[PDB]
Write a protein that binds this ligand. Structure first.
Ligand SMILES: [K+]
Ligand SMILES: [Mg+2]
Ligand SMILES: [Mg+2]
Ligand SMILES: [Mg+2]
Ligand SMILES: [Mg+2]
Ligand SMILES: [Mg+2]
Ligand SMILES: [Mg+2]
Ligand SMILES: [Mg+2]
Ligand SMILES: [Zn+2]
Lengths: 132, 102, 337, 223
RNA sequence: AUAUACCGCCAUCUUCAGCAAACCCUAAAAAGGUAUUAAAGUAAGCAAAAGAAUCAAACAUAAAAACGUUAGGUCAAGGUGUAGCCA
């Protein structure tokens, strides 16, 4: 049996999101890609470096917004610009989010030497695709 | 003035309008309990494991003048004083209650 | 390395080892480590305006700062106290009352049944357990599957009561199924003056014989522990009962409700025979008390009085009045029921 | 205001025959429709013997005098239920009369279930129909047996839900759980056609009577 | 050190057809619940099916394949519970 990225069946009481519900073979069929860069296109270089930056950027955002992320972040690179699109729960006060955006943007712009912007869409609670 | 306690708010919150022995259960082996209750719950200022309804509450006082407390230990229909196993009071307090009722 | 670090959800899953070959076919406890952490609080004690301290204080725009070594040690100790206090709260528990024994489920209250389809609350009803069987059955899933059969009773203490059997693989599910099924099978039991049955009742349900007796006020419930439990749910306060033959809990519950729900009130007897129903209490002397008068036409033919009745008498009842010594176990001093 | 609502709903119960259902039928009318013909003596149910006039050469005959009394009560009850805007469901499994009974229900303005009855329709209605489904307030059983000669499931299930039942009971039927039994023939087309006509006229009269009662009392409020 | 504490990622039956939960019903239920000219079962899940991919169409091929079985494989991908080393 295949155990990869499959949120296994419980007893109908586990709330899975749309992204979690779909197994790897549904990538490019029902669900898209969380990161979009040009480094895996044919005849393009720097796939290794773009992928390493993504791994870090996901661990950074989880720790910087602990318990406030409703779903996985979406990374969008255009030219040298990096854009982080995160669904965040409305737990923290509004002014605290302005602090973490100013901090996380400046810190990651001086670390990777690119303009980095953070885009946050606030949800009242995690969105449940189905109960499995 | 022991009678004052039974009219105070503290008594109402703890006991309501039920008798003071309503929510008491004796710990014993078997289903049939011993025919006498423990001799006494207090020995030399020490208290036993499961103090009886009278002993567990120090503010309750067994006095002939505190009639409202005494009535709880007498049958309203037959006017017979309950035996100690019925209410679970210790034998010391039961004798003291019987004398106060008499 | 920073890249070999996993999230808390994955770390606890591995450490707890709940899903494993040993667990399914035959203790570590989970903890949350972000419970007390406030965003912006670090071991170094830095103070971040807008994150862990007020952004503006007394009209002054705050700047970055760090707590002194003494101040930080206090904050560290305070959090340690709160964690220990939180652990103490976890240890503290509200003990519930036992039933007929400390390790048995019989006699244990499990609360009211759940609300109905249109917000029909049943807060006035109480549920009591009477039997809990944990039996293993044979099914291809695990070879031998597990099953819990629970018999419960429900009642509002004002004449309405019912019982049901619930089965499930989990004990919690059996409790829910039995509790909500019983609310659909509510008998109404007639109580004489709200505290006792209208008359003596003797019956045999399969191999379980019950013999109930109407008693005066203050007599209490001198009955099988299961009958005491149900009588409290029904609202009967004074009665005697004896159970003989088999002590099967289901036959005793079914047989009890069968007899209590088929009893004849005084008004019914007055209507059937057309005569007055008169009561004579020894504490009221010869005073005749009229407890039921026929609704329609009062008859004028006296009820036939035989010289010698043909009643079928029980040796157990009669034996006492014949002067025969009872058992050492009879009429012992017991706590108020 | 409150008096008017009380008048509409409380006045009808002060008259023995508020809807005058007595005139709709007569013993002679029932005898023309063969309502007195029962099954053979072998098929007789023990709880039907009270209603049987006798055995005419093997065929039990149904006393049409008791039928008139019982039918009067059943029709009166069916009218007060219809007057109060209650839901009435006609139920039968006889396939010869399936279309007739569905046409009758539609004419009355009520409901018919002449098809296979699903287990739990009444005891588990919320799962089948929806959370707030309103169950029938009265069930009229033109036939109380299913096609395997057993009681229709809805006879026991209607008692479980505390629903009164007006049922046509023949010599082989069990009337014990029928609230208002009507002893009579259920097999003959002329007998079933008479009963369907009576139930439809009775329901239409009660519905019309309610409309007239509402207009009179409503008109008084301005006037 | 322990895969006989585990996560992770898999093998095997297997492209086999089943696994699990909420209700309802029984002169009591240790269990069971089907009849279509129908007799108590109902309504949602997961798998299969369908759909998508191999850039028309079909077929085919891949992919998919639940719950369990083998304390199956992997402490040496990485992480990690418990025990052990720290001149
Ligand atoms: K493993
Ligand atoms: Mg114990
Ligand atoms: Mg017939
Ligand atoms: Mg293994
Ligand atoms: Mg090995
Ligand atoms: Mg295709
Ligand atoms: Mg497929
Ligand atoms: Mg092994
Ligand atoms: Zn004491």
């Amino acid at each position: 049996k295949n155990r990869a990225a499959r949120v296994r069946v419980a007893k109908g009481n586990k709330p899975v999101s749309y992204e979690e519900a779909h197994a790897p073979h549904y990538i490019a069929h029902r669900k898209g890609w969380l990161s979009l860069h040009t480094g895996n296109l044919d005849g393009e270089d720097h796939a290794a470096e773009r992928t390493l930056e993504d791994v870090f950027l996901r661990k950074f955002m989880m720790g910087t917004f602990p318990g406030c992320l409703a779903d996985q972040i979406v990374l969008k690179r255009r030219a040298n610009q990096v854009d982080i699109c995160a669904l965040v729960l409305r737990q923290l006060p509004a002014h605290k989010f302005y602090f973490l955006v100013g901090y996380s943007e400046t810190l990651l712009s001086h670390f990777y030497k690119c303009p980095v912007r953070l885009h946050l869409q606030t949800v009242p609670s995690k969105v449940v695709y189905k109960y499995i | 003035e022991p009678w004052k306690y039974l009219d105070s708010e503290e008594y109402h919150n703890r006991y309501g309008s039920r008798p003071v022995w309503a929510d008491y259960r004796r710990n014993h082996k078997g289903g049939v309990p011993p025919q006498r209750t423990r001799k006494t719950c207090i020995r030399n200022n020490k208290v036993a494991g499961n103090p009886c309804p009278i002993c567990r509450d120090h503010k309750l006082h067994v006095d002939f003048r505190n009639v409202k407390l005494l009535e709880q230990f007498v049958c309203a229909h037959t006017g017979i004083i309950f035996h100690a196993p019925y209410t679970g009071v210790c034998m010391k307090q039961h004798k003291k209650l019987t004398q106060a009722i008499q | 390395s920073f890249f070999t670090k996993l999230t808390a959800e994955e770390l606890w899953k591995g450490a707890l080892a709940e899903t494993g070959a040993g667990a399914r076919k035959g203790k570590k406890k989970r903890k949350d480590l972000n419970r007390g952490q406030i965003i912006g609080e670090g071991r170094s004690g830095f103070l971040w305006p807008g994150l862990n301290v007020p952004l503006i204080k007394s009209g002054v725009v705050q700047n970055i700062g760090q707590r002194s070594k003494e101040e930080q040690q206090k904050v560290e100790a305070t959090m340690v106290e709160q964690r220990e206090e939180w652990d103490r709260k976890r240890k503290i528990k509200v003990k519930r009352e036992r039933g007929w024994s400390g390790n048995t489920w019989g006699g244990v209250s499990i609360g009211p049944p759940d609300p109905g389809p249109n917000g029909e609350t049943y807060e006035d009803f109480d549920t009591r357990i009477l039997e809990v069987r944990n039996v293993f059955n044979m099914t291809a899933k695990e070879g031998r599957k597990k099953s819990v059969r629970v018999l419960v009773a429900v009642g509002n203490g004002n004449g309405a009561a019912g019982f049901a059997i619930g089965k499930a693989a989990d004990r919690g599910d059996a409790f829910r199924k039995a509790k909500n099924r019983a609310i659909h099978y509510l008998h109404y039991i007639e109580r004489y003056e709200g505290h006792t049955i209208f008359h003596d009742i003797s019956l045999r349900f399969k191999r379980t014989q019950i013999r109930m007796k109407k008693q005066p006020r203050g007599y209490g419930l001198r009955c099988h522990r299961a009958i005491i439990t149900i009588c409290r749910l029904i609202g009967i306060k004074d009665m005697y009962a004896r159970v003989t033959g088999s002590m099967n809990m289901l036959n005793l519950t079914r047989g009890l409700f069968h007899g209590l729900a088929r009893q004849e009130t005084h008004q019914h007897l007055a209507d059937k025979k057309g005569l007055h129903v008169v009561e004579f209490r020894e504490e009221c002397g010869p005073l005749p008390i009229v407890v039921a008068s026929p609704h329609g036409a009062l008859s004028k033919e006296p009820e036939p009085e035989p010289e010698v009745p043909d009643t079928k008498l029980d040796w157990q009842d009669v034996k006492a009045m014949q002067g025969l010594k009872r058992s050492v176990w009879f009429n012992l001093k017991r706590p108020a029921t | 205001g409150d008096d008017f609502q009380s008048r509409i709903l409380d006045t009808p119960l002060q008259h023995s025959d508020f809807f005058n259902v007595k005139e709709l039928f007569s013993v002679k009318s029932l005898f023309e429709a063969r309502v007195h013909l029962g099954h053979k003596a072998g098929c007789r149910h023990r709880f039907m013997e009270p209603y049987i006039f006798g055995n005419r050469l093997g065929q039990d005959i149904i006393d049409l005098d008791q039928t008139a009394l019982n039918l009067q009560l059943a029709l009166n009850f069916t009218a007060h239920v219809a007057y109060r805007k209650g839901i009435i469901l006609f139920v039968s499994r006889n396939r010869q009369f399936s279309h007739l009974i569905e046409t009758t229900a539609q004419a009355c303005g009520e409901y018919a279930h002449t098809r296979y009855f699903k287990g739990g329709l009444l005891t588990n209605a919320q799962l089948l129909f929806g959370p707030s489904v309103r169950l029938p307030d009265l069930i009229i059983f033109l036939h109380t047996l299913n096609n395997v000669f057993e009681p229709h499931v809805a006879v026991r299930d209607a008692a479980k839900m505390n629903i009164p039942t007006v049922g046509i009971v023949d010599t082989n039927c069990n009337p014990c759980l029928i609230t208002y039994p009507i002893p009579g023939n259920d097999d003959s087309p002329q007998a079933i056609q008479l009963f369907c006509k009576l139930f439809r006229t009775t329901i239409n009269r009660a519905k019309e009577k309610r409309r007239q009662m509402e207009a009179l009392h409503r008109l008084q409020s301005p006037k």
